[PDB]
Amino acid sequence: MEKQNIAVILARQNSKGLPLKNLRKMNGISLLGHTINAAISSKCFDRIIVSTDGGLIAEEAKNFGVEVVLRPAELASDTASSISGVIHALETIGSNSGTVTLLQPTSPLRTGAHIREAFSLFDEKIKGSVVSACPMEHHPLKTLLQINNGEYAPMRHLSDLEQPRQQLPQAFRPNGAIYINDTASLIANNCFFIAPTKLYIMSHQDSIDIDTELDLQQAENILNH
Amino acid sequence: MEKQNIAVILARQNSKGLPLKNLRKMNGISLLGHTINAAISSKCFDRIIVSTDGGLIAEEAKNFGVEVVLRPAELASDTASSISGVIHALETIGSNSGTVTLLQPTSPLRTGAHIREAFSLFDEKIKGSVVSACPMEHHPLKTLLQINNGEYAPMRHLSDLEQPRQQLPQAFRPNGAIYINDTASLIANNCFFIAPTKLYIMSHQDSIDIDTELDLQQAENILNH
Ligand SMILES: Nc1ccn([C@@H]2O[C@H](COP(=O)(O)O)[C@@H](O)[C@H]2O)c(=O)n1
Ligand SMILES: Nc1ccn([C@@H]2O[C@H](COP(=O)(O)O)[C@@H](O)[C@H]2O)c(=O)n1
Ligand SMILES: CC(=O)N[C@H]1[C@H]([C@H](O)[C@H](O)CO)OC(C(=O)O)=C[C@@H]1O
Ligand SMILES: CC(=O)N[C@H]1[C@H]([C@H](O)[C@H](O)CO)OC(C(=O)O)=C[C@@H]1O
Ligand SMILES: [Cl-]
Ligand SMILES: [Cl-]
C-alpha cells in the first residue's frame, strides 16, 4: 500500500483534571480546534484523524472537516496509553506505511509552523522520532520521589540535589505537542520514542499544556502578544 | 559552647545568569532584603549571617542590620557548593552547635511565617533535616537527559515518558527556600539532606525562584494580591 502522512489527534471526552478539557475554548476556539487548525495549516498531512470515545468530541472534529475514529472505552480510560489509541486509529483507517504524527490537543500554542519545522527534522532514511520538547526551568535530577508512606528518595544521587545546575547533564521535557514517527517503526516499537530521536525545541512558553482553568487563562494571555 | 540558631544566607555578588541577581529589586526591596526580612520576622534565629564575596552585597546586608561573612572567591565561584559556604560561615562565627538554616535569596516569596512553620517540623531529638519543597507541575521522570555523544536518554525508563501521570511515583522539588539542620549533623554529613528528612510543603507559587527578569516580573505579580 501507498505511503501516507497521518495526523492522529487523541481527544478523549471524559477528562478528569478538568471537565471536557479537549472542548474548552481558548480565544473562541476549542483545544481540539486549535490542534486541528495546526494540522490543517501545516499542510504536512494526507489525512487528519481525531480519535475519541465521545460524540461531543466527534461532532467538533466533523465541524472542522476532519475524520473521526471511535475508540472503545478500554482505549480511552485513564490508564490507557496514547500508543494504543494511535495504533487503533492506524488500524481503523488501514495505514501502516508513511508517517504518523501525534498532536495532543493539550498543546494549543503549537501551530502549523511548528509542525512544519518539526517535519524538516524527520529523516525518511533513518526513521528516528521527532519529538517536540522544551528546556526545563528546574532540573529533574534535583527532585525527590515518594518510595513509602513517609520516605523520599533522590531521583538519582543525594549530591545531585546540591550540584550547581551547569554540572548536571542537560535536561529536556517532551512537551506533548508533536511526536512524528515512521508508521511501520511506530507499529514495530509500540512507542513514540524511537532511536535515533531528534528533538524539536519549542519555547517553554509555546510548550504550555492544559491541566487546569489557570493554564487556559495563561495560554490566552500568551496568545494575545 | 552554647546552642545557637543561625540563619545563613548565601548571596554571591557576581551572578552569571542575571547580573547582580541577589540585589535585584522586587517591589522596591532587594532579593537579599526579602530573605533577610523573612529571617528577622520569623524570630527563629539568634544570629543572621549573610555570606558574600562582594561589598555591594555586604553593604546591603549591613543596612538591614545583619552580620556579614566575607567569602574567598573559591567559595563563591559558579562551581562552589552551598555547603562549603555555610560551613565556612559557621567556622567564621564559631558556631558548631544548635541549628543552621540556609535561606536562599532566590526565594523572595518565602516569608517569616514559612520559616516558623518549617521550624515546627524540626525535631531536636531526632535531628533530621527540614527542607522546603513543592509538588511539580510536570513529572521529572518524563524527561530526557543529554548523554555525551549527541543523544538523549530517558531519566529512568523509556516507558515512563508515556505513562499516565498518576501511575508514577509522587514527585517533590526542594525549592531552595529553606533548609533547616542540626549544626553538628550538618558539619558531620557535609550536606543539607540528613535522614530522617521532613519536607515542608509550599505552593508552587510561593516556591517561585529567580533565574530571569521574567521570574522577577512574575513574582511581583504574585506578591500584589
Ligand atoms: N489514552 C489517552 C491519553 C490521552 N488522551 C488525550 O491526549 C492529551 C494528553 O493528555 P495527558 O497529558 O493526560 O496524557 C489530552 O488531550 C488527553 O485527553 C487521549 O485522548 N487518550
Ligand atoms: N556557592 C553558592 C551557590 C549559590 N549561591 C546563591 O544561592 C542561591 C542559589 O543559587 P543556585 O540556585 O544557582 O545555586 C543564589 O542566590 C546564589 O547567588 C551562593 O551565594 N553561593
Ligand atoms: C542547597 C542547594 O541545593 N544549593 C545549590 C542550589 C539548589 O540546588 C537550588 O537552589 C535548588 O533550587 O542551586 C545551585 C545551582 O547552581 O543550581 C547551587 C547550590 O550549590
Ligand atoms: C505520547 C505520550 O507520552 N502520551 C502521554 C502523555 C504525555 O506524556 C504528556 O502529555 C507529555 O507532556 O501524558 C499522559 C498523561 O496521563 O499524563 C498519558 C499519555 O499516554
Ligand atoms: Cl484527558
Ligand atoms: Cl547567583
Protein model, in words:
The structure is a homodimer of 225-residue chains. Chain A is α/β, with parallel strands linked by helices. Chain A has one domain: Alpha-Beta Complex (Spore Coat Polysaccharide Biosynthesis Protein SpsA, Chain A). Chain A has seven helices and eleven strands. Chain A has helices spanning 31-42, 55-63, 82-93, 112-120, 158-162, 183-189, 213-223; strands at residues 4-10, 25-26, 29-30, 47-52, 67-70, 98-102, 130-135, 144-148, 151-154, 171-182, 198-201. In chain A, the strands form three sheets. Chain A has a seven-stranded mixed β-sheet, with helices on both faces. The interface between A and B is large, with 43 and 42 residues. Strand 8 (144-148) of chain A pairs antiparallel with strand 10 (171-182) of chain B. The structure holds cytidine-5'-monophosphate (C5P) (2 copies), 2-deoxy-2,3-dehydro-N-acetyl-neuraminic acid (2 copies) and chloride ion (2 copies). One 2-deoxy-2,3-dehydro-N-acetyl-neuraminic acid (DAN) sits between chains A (81-82, 102, 104, 174-176, 179, 192, 209) and B (142, 161-162, 164-165). Chains A, B: This is N-acylneuraminate cytidylyltransferase.
